[PDB]
Amino acid sequence: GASVADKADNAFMMICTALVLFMTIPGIALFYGGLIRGKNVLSMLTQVTVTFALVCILWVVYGYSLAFGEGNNFFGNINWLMLKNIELTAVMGSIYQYIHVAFQGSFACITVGLIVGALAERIRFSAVLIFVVVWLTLSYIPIAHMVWGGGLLASHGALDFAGGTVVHINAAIAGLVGAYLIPHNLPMVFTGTAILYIGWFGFNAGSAGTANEIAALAFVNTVVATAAAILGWIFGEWALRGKPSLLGACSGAIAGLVGVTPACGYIGVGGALIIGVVAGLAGLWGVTMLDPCDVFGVHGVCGIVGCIMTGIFAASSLGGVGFAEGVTMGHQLLVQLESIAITIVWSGVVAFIGYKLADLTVGLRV
Amino acid sequence: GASVADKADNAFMMICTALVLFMTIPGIALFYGGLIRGKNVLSMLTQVTVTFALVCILWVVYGYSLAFGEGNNFFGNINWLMLKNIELTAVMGSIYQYIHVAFQGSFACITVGLIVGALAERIRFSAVLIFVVVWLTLSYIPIAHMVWGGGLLASHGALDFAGGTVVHINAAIAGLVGAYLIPHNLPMVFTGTAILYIGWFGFNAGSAGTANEIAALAFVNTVVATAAAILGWIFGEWALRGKPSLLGACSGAIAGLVGVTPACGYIGVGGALIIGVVAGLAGLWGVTMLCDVFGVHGVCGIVGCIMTGIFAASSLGGVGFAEGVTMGHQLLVQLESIAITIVWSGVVAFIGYKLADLTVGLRV
Amino acid sequence: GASVADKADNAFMMICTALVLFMTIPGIALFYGGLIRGKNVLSMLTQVTVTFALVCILWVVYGYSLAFGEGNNFFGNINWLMLKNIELTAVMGSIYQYIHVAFQGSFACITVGLIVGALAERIRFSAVLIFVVVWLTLSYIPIAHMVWGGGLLASHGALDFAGGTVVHINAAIAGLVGAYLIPHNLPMVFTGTAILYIGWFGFNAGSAGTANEIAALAFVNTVVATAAAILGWIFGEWALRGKPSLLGACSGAIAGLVGVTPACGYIGVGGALIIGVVAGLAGLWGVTMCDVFGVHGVCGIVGCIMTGIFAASSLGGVGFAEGVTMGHQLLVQLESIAITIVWSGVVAFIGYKLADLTVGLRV
Ligand SMILES: CCCCCCCCC/C=C\CCCCCCC(=O)OC[C@@H](COP(=O)(O)OC[C@H](O)CO)OC(=O)CCCC/C=C/CCCCCCCCC
């Protein structure tokens, strides 16, 4: 018979949605606001706000359909615009589907906000807008379809709870391609980081789709992995430089959050402590190797770390929820690696195409 | 049988309530804080905090009762002070009534915060406090009764989901009457605007009273109408001045949110995109013509109340008018509701300011 | 049969938890950030962030178990580390127990954040870290066990809904002992205060454990008591100094919130108005006589006392337990306050000293 929405789940997920919107408006905007040069802040805030608005529109017009509708292994469909095929009472899992639409839309928003906040007043605004349309449509959307919309990576049992590939790796490589082709308020950075943290609970727990024990797990693991990464990074920084800094504390937080994103509803809390530690160190490594586009280093490295570790610590003998029936750790790690690899290439190529199309049309300079 | 509270609804509504309190403390305070002259900030923040407190007290003493209790077409009652007739387990709709008390009390708070943040250190504080008491009691309270408490406008089938009349038009007119009778931190304005946005999800979806498909519709329409307005305003501003600004982006956001407030749980998402666009442009128009903040709440409030009477129609993607109601009749009711709201609040604001003027005077 | 989690309660309590984490990160950090000297902000924010992280780790390792597991009247146990005895589906009250772990963990975090934000760049960081480990383990944890974990004060029917003893008095005394042994952005203070306020709805209503009428009561009483304290303080300050200030408005808010913390799900809304007024004035008195600790301490004591009066049904509260008189209940409230003060005074002393003798408390 018909799916019926559970009101507790509706409630949960609307609030989670509002918490993820919070992480863009104003979370990410304040994070970049205190990182970039003061002469550029007003214009950065405006470009995050405007592209946020743009993403919201594109999402309901066609983006939700092309990401989550029936299609092939790579794309959904645009058979219906503006949510027209979706009755107001339609249910997806245990919530009204409209709530699923907003929740997933808020994901596209933070993902784009991440990129846009770094590239603002480096590439011309015109060129950001063309990049956003191209890359959302042809990278974000299909990669979401592949991982969460029944496409290719989902059909091979890829594990990515809340978006190590779809959000983090995806965006990291778009930013780095953009960076290749080209701090004044630290309390403001702390504030953004803090907002990003609180919001991420909606991100990570809400990705369970219901207020059940998987969301609880995801919640607890977020707390733990973030804390362990803060300490991971901070100890690494004390060692490497003799003093620990506020920006190091914040970066570590971000590193654990990223690292735990793919893993959070699949692993045990011991797992999460380990993932956090490693992610915190790997992120300190990443930036040290490599300019606000260091942010992409952390999303990228820690995204890869977290997608790998999900394939280990999901195992029931390590405290995780368990692999799917008949799956071995070695097989699963192979699928995690293939998923990472495909995500990197796909987004590299699409980012390239988007930037060039912008360059040849309006140019990338100010 | 007895009404039974649904715990999911309770949960939803307590979180929505906290989100709407958020939009006053600190949302609206930070929004005005970066708009007004620096020499006036500390005193503005204090007055918003104090009057917020005052509203909370008046609300539980008599305000909730006079707004939502059985009365007239215009007022409820004050038969019981301090929620005394309300058992702890009493249920209103699908939630404990105490939650309905806090939710609606947070609405009075943001409404007043709106007015107070603009009038701080223009009219003396004494006079703000007299104005607040008079106008909350005699404008906010009866207009809420008329629209959401079974009074006059609700009995004619007026559509106003979350307060285009009650909050926006009502407050716009009080502010403008106050303005007639008399920008240093733009990142702070962004922050306030952002908090106002996040909170507004509690405002708008919470006005459904339950975590159902109407709250979901309200949620999605808020996302969409805000985004469309941001763009609406921003494209208008690029045209009119050659450059788009951060303050324009934020104003657009506010315009869509105001515009979608009355409409949000009655219209379809296509409707919401249209409303947002128009509300964004109408708000850019409003300020350009011209406490500009009141221009936007007022013009966009009127825009949204009108458009609710169109796009609520099933053939336009809305939830549908009540049985036997035509679009033309419904538009007529929307207009009557707007008209009555403007006069009622204009007259009561006048009375409140004068009473303050004649008692303490309206400066230093 | 087995306890089954109610999903609405899960949802409610995960959100409440996030709201309490919010009060530390960034709430308390911004509150202290605008109070302390500018030269010290960056380092204060770092120390709050790091000790927050530390508390989260210690909590899941052993702290939750030692606070809420079966033990004696004072401590739980550490029979299992890292939540190992807790199945993912285990239920505590009407929620998954993992949610209870996070909710109570976020309490330990704000309690510590309160202390750490005041002592940062006064006492060396080394010494803060030793103090935190000692005092969380030996003061926060057993006092939570005693009040909410079935220990001594709970078995005598002590009333403390959301932590007038456990959080406020406990932390006040640790801070004052620390202060004895040793404002540049007022809008930032307002912001922190506002975040602390919003977060406190999760603190206070969430302490009911479920989205029911007790959480509703707790919610409403938080609105009302905070408002009444704002006014209480502000009228007191106008009188005492001729002008009311933004910092006074914020301090009053904090005073009503502290005051109403123990009382909030036991008293009626008339009770809450009175508690707020008194707490606002008692806090203005306290500071007038690390002033932050004065307010948490006085208003914590005020609230724990008033809980024992206004919980009475004849005053609009939910009622004392069967056979309990107001006089008996006040006696218990006093005994609880007294024990909390001495216990945390003694443990704070031990912690600071151990730090002093190991690293300095200076530089
Ligand atoms: C300030 C310096 C001086 C001190 C003043 C203190 C402040 C005033 C408050 C003082 C006392 C509270 C009143 C007593 C109630 C407490 C007992 C209580 O809980 O309730 C008392 C009851 C009467 O007994 P009951 O229980 O029915 O019989 C039981 C049984 O049936 C038997 O048969 O009702 C009232 O007294 C309600 C009185 C309402 C007062 C109006 C206030 C504001 C109106 C609008 C205007 C808004 C406010 C304007 C003024 C601030």
DSSP A31-93: HHHTTS-GGGHHHHHHHHHHHHHHHHHHIIIIIHHHHHSS-SSS----SSSTTTT--TT-EET
Residue contact A198–C57, C-beta within 8 A: no
Q: What is the signed CA dihedral for C150, C156, C162, C165, rounded to 10 degrees?
A: -110
Residue A156 DSSP class: T
Enumerate the residues of chain A whose CB falls inside 8 A of the CB of residue B226: 53, 56
- Is B322 exposed, middle or buried, given 0-12, 13-18 or 19+ CB atoms closer than 10 A? exposed
Token reading at C75: 């401590």
Segments of chain C assigned E as strands: 91-92, 95-96
Residues with CB under 6 A from ligand 1: B 61-62, 81; C 270
Token reading at A187: 């309390």
SS3 call for A279: helix
Instruction: Assess contact for C351 and C343: CB atoms under 8 A.
Output: no
Task: Give the CA distances from residue B335 to residues A42, C83, C241, in Å, rounded to whole numbers and listed in that order.
Answer: 40, 61, 51
Residue contact C52–A227, C-beta within 8 A: yes
**Distance between CA B238 and CA A33 in Å, rounded?**
23
Cα of C270 from ligand 1 centre, angstroms:
10
Enumerate the residues of chain C whose CB falls inside 8 A of the CB of residue A227: 52-57
Q: Which atom of ligand 1 is nearest to the CA of C315?
A: 19
- Is A243 exposed, middle or buried, given 0-12, 13-18 or 19+ CB atoms closer than 10 A? exposed
Residue B120 DSSP class: B
Mutation pick from A197, A224, A266, A274 vs chain C, by most beta carbons of C within 10 Å, is A224
**Distance between CA C11 and CA A212 in Å, rounded?**
8
Residue contact C273–B60, C-beta within 8 A: yes
Comparing CA positions, the residue from C117, C225, C114 lying closest to residue C170 is C114
**Distance between CA C293 and CA C173 in Å, rounded?**
7
Instruction: Please choose from B59, B81, B85, B134 the residue to mutate so as to test ligand 1's pocket, defined by most ligand atoms within 8 A of CB.
Output: B81
Q: What is the signed CA dihedral for A189, A195, A196, A201, rounded to 10 degrees?
A: 160
**Distance between CA C108 and CA C90 in Å, rounded?**
22
CATH of the domain at C308: 1.10.3430.10
Domain enclosing residue C250, as ranges: 1-363
**Distance between CA B100 and CA C209 in Å, rounded?**
20
Residue C51 DSSP class: H
Instruction: Please choose from B61, B64, B83 the residue to mutate so as to test ligand 1's pocket, defined by most ligand atoms within 8 A of CB.
Output: B61
User: After which residues are there C–N gaps above 2.5 Å in chain B?
Assistant: 182, 290
Helix axes C97-119, C170-180, angle to 10 degrees: 20
SS3 call for B209: coil
Q: What is the signed CA dihedral for B151, B156, B162, B165, rounded to 10 degrees?
A: -80
Residue contact A46–B15, C-beta within 8 A: no
SS3 call for B96: strand
Cis peptide before B26 (omega within 30 of 0): yes
Mutation pick from B44, B57, B92 vs chain C, by most beta carbons of C within 10 Å, is B57
Experimental method: X-ray
Token reading at B6: 């649904």
Cα within 13 Å of Cα(C86), Cβ side: 28
Comparing CA positions, the residue from B206, B187, B185, B234 lying closest to residue B94 is B206
Helix axes B97-119, B141-148, angle to 10 degrees: 130
Enumerate the residues of chain A whose CB falls inside 8 A of the CB of residue B95: none
CA distance B231 to chain A (A): 7
**Distance between CA C46 and CA C43 in Å, rounded?**
5
- Is B177 exposed, middle or buried, given 0-12, 13-18 or 19+ CB atoms closer than 10 A? buried
Beta-bridge partner residues of C91: C96
Helix axes A7-22, B186-205, angle to 10 degrees: 170
**Distance between CA C163 and CA C344 in Å, rounded?**
14
Task: Give the CA distances from residue B11 to residues A146, B200, C6, C329, in Å, rounded to whole numbers and listed in that order.
Answer: 34, 17, 12, 32
CA distance B5 to chain A (A): 12
Helix (H) or strand (E) holding A283: helix A269-289
Bridging pattern class, strands C91-92 and A95-96: unpaired
- In DSSP notation, B247-272 reads HHHHHHHHHHHHHHTTTTTTS-HHHH
* Position B170, amino acid: N
Give the rounded distance of the alpha carbon of A66 from its chain centre: 18
Cα Rg of chain B (Å, integer)? 19
**Distance between CA A265 and CA A201 in Å, rounded?**
12
Q: Which residue of A has its CA nearest to B208?
A: A11
Mutation pick from C31, C36, C45, C189 vs chain A, by most beta carbons of A within 10 Å, is C45
Task: Give the CA distances from residue B343 to residues A22, B177, B334, B336, C179, in Å, rounded to whole numbers and listed in that order.
Answer: 38, 11, 15, 11, 59
* Position A354, amino acid: G
**Distance between CA B327 and CA B267 in Å, rounded?**
13
Cα of B125 from ligand 1 centre, angstroms:
28
Enumerate the residues of chain C whose CB falls inside 8 A of the CB of residue B56: 223-224, 226-227
Instruction: Assess contact for A151 and A73: CB atoms under 8 A.
Output: yes
Chains that touch A (3 or more CB pairs under 8 A): B, C
Token reading at C121: 């760049």
Q: What is the resolution of this structure in A?
A: 2.3
Helix (H) or strand (E) holding A95: strand A95-96
> What phi-psi label fits residue B83: left (phi over 0), alpha (psi between -120 and 50 degrees) or beta?
left
* Position C62, amino acid: Y
Instruction: Assess contact for C280 and C232: CB atoms under 8 A.
Output: yes
Instruction: Assess contact for C97 and C91: CB atoms under 8 A.
Output: yes
Which residues fall within 8 angstroms of residue B220, CB to CB, at 6 or more apart?
A60, A98, A101, A102, B269, B272
- What are the phi and psi torsion angles at C75 (to 5°)? -135, 160
CA distance C25 to chain A (A): 5
* Option in C8, C25, C96 nearest A194 (CB): C25
**Distance between CA B220 and CA B233 in Å, rounded?**
20
Residue contact C7–A223, C-beta within 8 A: no
- Is A335 exposed, middle or buried, given 0-12, 13-18 or 19+ CB atoms closer than 10 A? middle
Task: Give the CA distances from residue B210 to residues A8, A104, A361, B32, B214, in Å, rounded to whole numbers and listed in that order.
Answer: 10, 22, 49, 32, 8
Residue C63 DSSP class: I
**Distance between CA B244 and CA B237 in Å, rounded?**
6
Token reading at C65: 């178990």
User: After which residues are there C–N gaps above 2.5 Å in chain C?
Assistant: 182, 289
Residue contact B190–A101, C-beta within 8 A: no
Buried residues in B116-154 as b, exposed as e (16+ CB within 10 A)? bbbbbbbbebebbbbbbbbbbbbbbbbbbbbbbbbbbbb
Mutation pick from C16, C25, C52, C126 vs chain A, by most beta carbons of A within 10 Å, is C25
| N-term to C-term CA, chain A | 58
Enumerate the residues of chain A whose CB falls inside 8 A of the CB of residue B231: 50, 53-54, 57
CA distance A218 to chain B (A): 20
Cis peptide before C262 (omega within 30 of 0): no
Token reading at B277: 């666009």
Number of domains chain C contains:
1
- In DSSP notation, C83-117 reads TTT--TT-EETTEEHHHHHHHHHHHHHHHHHHHHH
Task: Give the CA distances from residue A243 to residues A234, A249, C126, C325, in Å, rounded to whole numbers and listed in that order.
Answer: 9, 12, 13, 58
Residue B316 DSSP class: G
Cα of B276 from ligand 1 centre, angstroms:
48
Residue contact C8–B5, C-beta within 8 A: no
Comparing CA positions, the residue from A163, A159, A164, A214 lying closest to residue A331 is A159
- Report which protein residue has its CA nearest ligand 1's atom 17: C315
CA distance A205 to chain C (A): 9
SS3 call for A123: strand
Cα C350–Cα C355–Cα C359 angle in degrees, nearest 5: 160
Helix axes A41-58, A97-119, angle to 10 degrees: 150
**Distance between CA C268 and CA C313 in Å, rounded?**
9
- In DSSP notation, A182-236 reads ----HHHHHHHHHHHHHHHHHHHHGGGSSSSHHHHHHHHHHHHHHHHHHHHHHHH
Cα Rg of chain C (Å, integer)? 19
Comparing CA positions, the residue from B166, B247, B151 lying closest to residue B203 is B166
Comparing CA positions, the residue from C263, C202, C205 lying closest to residue C23 is C202
Q: Which atom of ligand 1 is nearest to the CA of B61?
A: 43
**Distance between CA B63 and CA B279 in Å, rounded?**
32
**Distance between CA A256 and CA C16 in Å, rounded?**
22
* Option in C14, C42, C49 nearest A230 (CB): C49
- What are the phi and psi torsion angles at C333 (to 5°)? -65, -45
* Position C71, amino acid: G
**Distance between CA B300 and CA B163 in Å, rounded?**
12
Residue contact C223–B102, C-beta within 8 A: yes
SS3 call for B159: coil
Residue contact C230–B53, C-beta within 8 A: yes
**Distance between CA A151 and CA A157 in Å, rounded?**
10
Residue A316 DSSP class: G
Instruction: Assess contact for C172 and C294: CB atoms under 8 A.
Output: yes
Residue B301 CB neighbour total at 10 angstroms: 31
User: After which residues are there C–N gaps above 2.5 Å in chain A?
Assistant: 182, 290
Token reading at B121: 């250190």
Instruction: Assess contact for C102 and C14: CB atoms under 8 A.
Output: yes
Helix (H) or strand (E) holding B95: strand B95-96
Instruction: Assess contact for B22 and B195: CB atoms under 8 A.
Output: yes
Helix (H) or strand (E) holding B91: strand B91-92
- In DSSP notation, B19-63 reads HHHHIIIIIIHHHHHTTS-GGGHHHHHHHHHHHHHHHHHHIIIII
Which residues fall within 8 angstroms of residue C338, CB to CB, at 6 or more apart?
none
Cα of B248 from ligand 1 centre, angstroms:
50
> What phi-psi label fits residue C332: left (phi over 0), alpha (psi between -120 and 50 degrees) or beta?
alpha
Cis peptide before A26 (omega within 30 of 0): yes
**Distance between CA B217 and CA B208 in Å, rounded?**
10
Residue A168 DSSP class: I
Residue C80 DSSP class: S
* Option in C26, C53, C82 nearest A269 (CB): C82
